A paper describes a structure:
We therefore developed a strategy to covalently capture [name] with [name] via its nucleotide cosubstrate, thus allowing us to characterize the [name]:[name]:PC complex by x-ray crystallography. AnkX1–800 reveals a scoop-like structure that consists of the globular FIC domain (amino acids 1 to 350) and 13 curved ARs (amino acids 351 to 800). Thus, [name] is forming a cavity in whose center [name] is embraced. Whereas ARs 1 to 4 are serving as structural support for the FIC domain ARs 5 to 13 are forming multiple interactions to [name]. In [name], no electron density is observed for the amino acids 68 to 74 of the switch II region (amino acids 64 to 83). Although the modified S76Rab1b is ordered in the complex structure, no electron density is observed for PC and the linker between PC and G108CAnkX. However, the switch II loop of [name] including S76Rab1b is not reaching into the catalytic pocket of [name], indicating that the structure may represent a postcatalytic complex. The crystal structure of AnkXG108C:PC:[name]:GDP revealed three interfaces for [name] binding. F143AnkX is located at the tip of the thorn and binds into a hydrophobic pocket of [name] between switch II and α3. [name] locally unfolds the GTPase switch II by F143AnkX-mediated displacement of Y78Rab1b.
Residue numbers in the entry:
A (entry chain A): 8 to 85, 94 to 800
B (entry chain B): 2 to 66, 74 to 172
Amino acid sequence: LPGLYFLQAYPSEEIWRLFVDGRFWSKENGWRGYESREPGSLNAALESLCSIALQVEKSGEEFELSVDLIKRIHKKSGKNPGELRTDEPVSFCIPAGRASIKGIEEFLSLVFLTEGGAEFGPGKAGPFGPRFDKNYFKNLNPEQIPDLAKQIYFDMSKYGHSNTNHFYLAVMKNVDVYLEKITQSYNKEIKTAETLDEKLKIIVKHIRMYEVLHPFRDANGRTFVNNLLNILLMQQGLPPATFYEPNVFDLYSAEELVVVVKEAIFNTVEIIEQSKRKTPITLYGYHSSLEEQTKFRDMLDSPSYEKIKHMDFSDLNPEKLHLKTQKCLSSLNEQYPLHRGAIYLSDPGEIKLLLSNRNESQINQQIEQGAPPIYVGKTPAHLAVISGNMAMLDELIAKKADLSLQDYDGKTALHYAAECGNMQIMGKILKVVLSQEDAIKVLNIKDNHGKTAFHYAAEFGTPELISALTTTEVIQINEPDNSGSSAITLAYKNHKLKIFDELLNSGADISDELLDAIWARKDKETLGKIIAKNEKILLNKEAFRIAISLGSVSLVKKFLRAGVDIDIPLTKDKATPLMLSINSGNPKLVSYLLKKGANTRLTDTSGNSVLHYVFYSKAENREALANIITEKDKKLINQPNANGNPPLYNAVVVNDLKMATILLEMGARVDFEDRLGNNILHSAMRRCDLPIILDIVKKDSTLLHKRNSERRNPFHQALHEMHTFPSSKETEEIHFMNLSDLLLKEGVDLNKKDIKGKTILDIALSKQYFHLCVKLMKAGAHTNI
Amino acid sequence: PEYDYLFKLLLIGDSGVGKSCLLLRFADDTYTESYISTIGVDFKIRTIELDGKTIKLQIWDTAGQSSYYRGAHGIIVVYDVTDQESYANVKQWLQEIDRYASENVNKLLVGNKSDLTTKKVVDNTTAKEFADSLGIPFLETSAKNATNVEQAFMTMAAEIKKRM
Ligand SMILES: Nc1nc2c(ncn2[C@@H]2O[C@H](COP(=O)(O)OP(=O)(O)O)[C@@H](O)[C@H]2O)c(=O)[nH]1
Ligand SMILES: [Mg+2]
C-alpha cells in the first residue's frame, strides 16, 4: 500500500534525522540535544512512526484517512492524552521568520478561525495564556485582508525576524466538528487529485489546517507533521520528509509549503544517495564523529522499526520509484540555485561552473519572504558560512561577494562564522573584511539581538578564535548587547572557561550583571580569580556583598585588606556587612567581623538589630549565631523602632520555640509592644501553638488588650477564620488549655471587634462552641449584644 | 512514595511583591534582601503534615518570561501592601484564572511586606472586604518577619484538601 522502501533503505546508523530538526544538528551535536531534552523521546517518536507503519499495512482495505487513527498516532506519542480538546485554551508564539505575506492571507481567509473566535495578533506572554494588545479576528473585513497581511508582517518583522511579538490561541469550541469536516474534505480532494504534484498540494493544504486547528492538548506537531505527513508521503511512493524547520505549517501559504516538503523530500533522498556512495555526510553543517555514531547503535532500541528492516521488498522494483521522485524534485533547481548550491554542493568543478558569469545583483541576492524559512534574508555567503561549505565560500570570495550585508535577523557572514565556530572559514572572511576601507565598521556591526560578531565568538568558540578577533584591534570588547550582557559575561554563563580566562587576562572592564550570575551559581573561586587578576574590584560594593553573603572568611579578608569601612551600608535597606554575614554562610565570618570591631548596634532601614537578622537564617544555624552575637553586645532588648518588637517576636512568628525559649532564658524583657498595640502574647496566641511557653511568659508580666481586640485569646479566634473541620476538634481543644489559664487571670471580657463583635459572638460564628461557648458562659463571660 | 496528596501550588502577582521571598521563607526557611533567582529553578517543594496526613507541596514561582502552569490545584495571588498598583492589578490576575484555569481551583489573596507598617498604603479591611466579596480567604504576610508565611500555605493546603 504505502511504498516505505526509503525507511528500510534509510541508513539505520543515521535514521535519527527524521524526527530531529536540521536547525539543531549544527549546534546541538546532532541528536544529543534532543536526547538531553527528553531521553528516548525520539526512540518513542520513531516507534510511533514505525508502530503506525505496521498498523496501516496489515489492515490493507485501500486505507483512507480515519479520525480513529489520527487519535491512535497521538496514543503512540504519549485530563487524559489521545483525547480531543474541548474548551481548553492552547496558544503559542510564531516569529516573522516562520511567516509569509501570502501565508497570512490564507491564515486570515480561513473563516472557521474567525467564527470559532481564536485569539490572534500581537501582545506579550502571560503565566497561563497570552495577553493581546489587538485581535485581528473580532470584526474583520475580508477586503482589508491583503493590505492587512503586509501590515502585520511589517509588525512581526520590525520587532524581530526570529523573535516573537505575535501569539495565537486556537478555537476553543466545535473541535470534534471542525476536525471531521477536514478529515472528510481530504478524502474528497485526494479523489479529485489528477496530477502527481497536485496530490502533494492538497496533502500540505490539509495538514496545514490540521496544524492551525491545534485540537490536541500537546504534540500537535509530532502527530500531524513528523508522523501523518510522512505516512501520506510514503503511501504515494515519495520518501519521508527530513526537514530543517518543519514549524511553518501555521503561517506559510499552501503552495509555499509544497516547496518546504519537496526540500525535506530532497533532503531525505540526499541522505539515501550519500549513504550508498559511502562518502562522509555533512548536511546543515553537522559532521558525524565516530564516537557519536558508535554510541548510537548500542543505544538504538526501537524494535517495531527493526522488523520493517528485516522485511522483504524484492516484489517491488526500486527504479520504478526513482523516476517518480525526480518528477517533483526537478522544480527546486531553477529558483535560487546559488543559495541551494551553498547547502548541498562540494565539488569545486561543479561549484565554479554554477558561479560562471554571475552578475553582482545575482551574487548578493537576499531571498525575500515566502520561500522556505532557512533561505529568507540570506546571501549565498551566509548559507555557505553556516553549512561550512568552504568550497562555495572560496568561489564567492573569488567573485568579491558583499560580506558586509546582514540578513533579516541582523547577523552578517562574520556573525555566523563565530556562532558556528569554524576558525578556518572565519580566517577566509577576516582577510577579505580587513581589505575593505570600512573594515573597523563592518567588524563592529550589531544584529537585532544587539550582539556583535565578537559576542557570538565568546558565547560560542575557542580562545584561539577570540585571539584572531582581538588581534584585529577592534577595541569593542567592553560593549554590552541589548540584554546588557558583556562579551565576558556571556562567556561565563556558558561555562566557556579557557575563553573566559583569556577575556579576564585581557582585563575587560567587569560588569555588575556578571557578579549576579556568580551569585546564582554561588561560584566563590571565579570571584577569587576575578579579585586576583583585576585586583582593584574590592572597591565594588556589590562585589563585597557576594564575598560577605556566601563568600569565605578568606575572600572577605581581602576586602578589609583593601580597607573599606566595616560598617558601610551596601544594600537598598542599608544592611551592614555583619548583618549580611549572619543571613547565610560560615559563622567563622560573623566572629571575624566582630573580632575586627564590626559595630553591633546599627539598624537597617526598617530598624532591625543584627540579632533580628539571625531569624532571617535557617533555624539550624540560628542557635550558634544568636550566641556568637550576644557574647559581644548582650543588647537583645534593642528592636525595630519602626514596629518596636525585639527578636523574641521574630522567634514567635517563625514558630522556633528553641530560640523563643533560649532568648527568654537569656532574660529577654516582655515589656515591649508594637505601634498598633499588640503584645508578645498577641503573636504567641496561636503561632506558638504550645502552652508550656504561654505559662512561663504570663508568669513574668500582665497581658493587655489593645487595638479593640482583647489579649491574645480574644484576637486568637479573629485570626482563625477558616476553622478547618478535621482540626476543628483540635482548634476548640487548644483554647481549653488557653482559657483555664485565662480564667485564673480574670480576663475582663470586653467587646473584641471594631464592628461590635466580641469573644462570644465570634466563637458562635466560629462554630467551635462545643468546648468554649459553654466554658465561657459557665465562667461568667457575657453573651453577645 | 505513597505520600497522601502531593498538591501543586502556584504563586502569581505583579513582579516585586515578593513571590520568590515568600517561597524561600516557606521552603528553605530563610530570607535574603536581594533576589538569587535560584538559577531559574522555576519551582520549590515542601512536605507538611496537616490533619495527621503527610502532604507534599509542589510550589511554582512566576518568572518575567510545555504549558505546566495550568496543572496547579491552588493559586496564591500575591500583592505588595506598600504598592497600591500591585493590589489594583489583583483584579486582572483573578480574571486570568477565570480564563486559563479550572473554576474548581482554590484561590487565596496574600498581602506581602506586612513588616513595612511605616510605609503601608493598602488597607487591611478594604482588601478583606474585596476578598470576602468573592468568598476568597485573605492573609497578610512578611517573608522578612516570616509572619503568617506557614499559615498562608497551611490554609491553602487545607482549602484544597476540603474540596479535593
Ligand atoms: N521589607 C520587606 N521586603 C520584602 C519582603 N518580601 C520581599 N521583599 C523585597 O522584594 C524584593 C524582591 O522580592 P522577590 O521575591 O524577588 O519579588 P517577586 O518579583 O515577587 O519574586 C527584595 O529585594 C526584597 O527586599 C518583605 O516581607 N519585607
Ligand atoms: Mg520571581
